[PDB]
């Protein structure tokens, strides 16, 4: 309609600074298909991989702190907790393990997932984590009693990212069924099922200050306030690659990594793509490989960290692009 387009044209987005590559830390001998940082501090960030390991990394130096070898198969995801000094990690060996960070050694392997487990999210407020695998089910664990407390049946296929919010919409799943769910853990049921994607929403992330949750199928990055479970915006992601990552920055600077490796940045809520970045790879590696598989920002937000399939981790420092809608 003309009534909306005109309005869109009238409104302007804020000039977010562009992004330039800063650090590249070829250290893993495998994909680096998870990355995470400490809520409390931003000194280190760990990165689980197809190595089977996960390595810890000092941001400032870029130096490899230490390794951790508590899986058999490849690590798919990790989550350092704000409220406790535990690092949860999870691998396609079906193990959702829990590393003490006072001793850097596993403690509570949680057992229950029938098959390769894709993501963890620690609940920001509770002493409870949430994991989901190709199982097609998101189980919540009491961390003390290392048992699945509840489980969330709804989904009809493998479930990827499964973020935890502190409100009522306490889990924000995202499947290959292309539904992204909002659940009520307490009710033992769904509350609202965002079906707006076309394909496997293989990426989703909570906004820090804004109580919303960007989510990405093969192209269209939707983003939504999950209070009602209502759409907020659609991003200009029109011919970008298969969106692997979908991290959001503190300053409303949503990042999206592709299977292409084209690092695409967007103003959040606007839905305005305001940068593209061509990937890079090593002289030995192939041009098809290069692809940002996992990524996240620091708590401040000036450094984006992208794990790419070059067996690398690339950290990114910081005139905006013209609007032009449909």
């Amino acid at each position: 309609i003309v009534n909306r387009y005109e309005k869109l044209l009238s409104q302007r987005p804020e000039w977010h600074a562009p992004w330039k590559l800063s650090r590249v830390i070829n250290g893993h001998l495998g994909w680096v298909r998870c990355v995470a940082i400490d809520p409390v501090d931003n000194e280190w960030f760990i990165t689980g991989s197809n190595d089977t390991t996960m390595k810890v990394w000092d941001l400032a130096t870029g130096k490899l702190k230490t390794t951790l070898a508590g899986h058999v198969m490849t690590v798919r995801d990790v989550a350092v907790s704000d409220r406790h000094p535990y690092l949860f990690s999870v691998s396609e060996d079906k193990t959702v393990k829990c590393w003490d960070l006072e001793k850097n050694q596993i403690i509570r392997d949680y057992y229950g997932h029938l098959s390769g487990v894709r993501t963890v999210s620690i609940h920001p407020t509770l002493d409870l984590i949430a994991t989901a695998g190709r199982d097609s089910v998101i189980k919540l664990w009491d961390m003390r009693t290392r048992i699945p407390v509840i489980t969330l049946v709804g989904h009809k296929g493998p479930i990827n990212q499964v973020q935890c919010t502190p409100v009522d919409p306490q889990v924000v799943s995202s499947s290959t069924d292309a539904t992204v769910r909002l659940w009520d853990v307490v009710a033992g049921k769904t509350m609202k099922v965002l079906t707006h994607h076309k394909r496997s929403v293989r990426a989703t992330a909570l906004h820090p200050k804004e109580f919303s949750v960007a989510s990405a199928c093969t192209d269209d990055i939707r983003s939504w306030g999950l209070a009602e479970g209502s759409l907020l915006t659609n991003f200009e992601s029109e011919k970008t690659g298969i969106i692997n990552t979908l991290s959001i920055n503190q300053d409303d600077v949503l990042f999206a990594g592709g299977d292409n490796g084209v690092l695409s940045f967007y103003d959040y809520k606007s839905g305005h793509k305001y940068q593209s970045l061509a990937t890079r790879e090593m002289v030995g590696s192939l041009e098809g490989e290069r692809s940002v598989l996992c990524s996240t920002f620091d708590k401040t937000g000036l450094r984006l960290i992208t794990g790419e399939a070059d067996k690398s981790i690339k950290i990114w420092k910081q005139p905006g692009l013209a609007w032009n809608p449909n």
Partner: protein, 248 residues
């Protein structure tokens, strides 16, 4: 669902369904289907409304054309005209670039002009083209076409101007200048000629000489200017030119 309804031959329900479908900003195809259905039904009251709705939902100039075509098929000439006006008005109204390509608007304008021509009164077409010009190349072309169809002198002049512009862009030059002069307005033509001269190895020299000669001729037709030209030539530095100057 629609086909089932058709088979049944209960039509109100089908209509309702169609309406519902069309409220969900569906495909152009759906809209077209709906239109077809409406046509098939006896009434042509409501079809217009639906078309309007479609247009509103799909700001696309092809839609407008389609609507017009329906109008044409229908008996009323006034209605078609009104529709055209509305289309034009809508295009005008969004001055901001929230728009279908400038080719599509041009096309629409052309169509309107054609319609007008087919109708009794031609002034209207001319007016429309003037309006178009005021609010580019495509538009100009359309205007020219309209003129041809039909004022003729004016059209010719416009064409000449366009040609001159093209030549300038490319940059024959002398010829262009001459044409401009002819078109003139006279003052403007003269200015253009002067500019050309200013703009203006052996071949180049020859061209320059020719230009100078032309200028001299112009002056004659119209002494100080000639003197100035001579001075300029001298500075640049021919014998023939000097001789001519002396004679003058």
């Amino acid at each position: 669902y629609l086909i089932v309804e058709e088979s049944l031959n209960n039509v109100e329900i089908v209509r309702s369904l169609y309406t519902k479908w069309c409220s969900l900003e569906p495909g152009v195809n759906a809209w077209n289907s709906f239109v077809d259905f409406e046509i098939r039904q006896k009434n042509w009251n409501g079809v217009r409304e639906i078309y309007s709705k479609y247009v509103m939902a799909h700001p696309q100039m092809q839609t407008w054309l389609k609507w017009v075509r329906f109008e044409n098929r229908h008996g009323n000439t006034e209605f078609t005209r009104s529709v055209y006006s509305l289309a034009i008005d809508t295009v005008a109204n969004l001055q901001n670039l929230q728009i279908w390509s400038d080719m599509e608007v041009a096309k629409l304008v052309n169509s309107f002009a054609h319609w007008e021509a087919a109708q009794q009164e031609y002034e209207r077409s001319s007016a429309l083209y003037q309006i178009a010009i005021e609010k580019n190349q495509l538009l100009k072309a359309g205007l020219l076409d309209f003129e041809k169809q039909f004022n003729s002198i004016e059209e010719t002049i416009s064409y000449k101007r366009k040609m001159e512009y093209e030549t300038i862009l490319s940059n024959y030059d002398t010829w262009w200048l001459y044409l401009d002069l002819i078109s003139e307005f006279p003052k403007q033509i003269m200015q253009t000629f002067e500019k050309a001269i200013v703009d203006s190895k052996n071949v180049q020299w020859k061209r320059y000489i020719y230009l100078w000669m032309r200028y001299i001729c112009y002056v004659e037709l119209e002494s100080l200017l000639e003197e100035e030209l001579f001075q300029r030539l001298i500075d640049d530095i021919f014998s023939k030119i000097w001789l001519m100057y002396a004679k003058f």
